[PDB]
Amino acid sequence: KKALLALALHHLAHLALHLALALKKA
Numbered sequence: 001k002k003a004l005l006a007l008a009l010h011h012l013a014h015l016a017l018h019l020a021l022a023l024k025k026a
Contacts, residue, residue, distance in 0.1 A: 003010075
């Protein structure tokens with residue numbers, strides 16, 4: 001089974017947090 005629809009929809013936001021953290025840094 002492959003919930004593509006869900007995979008597509010679900011995995012929408014995620015790459016940001018990282019990039020965000022990386023950019024914002026500390």
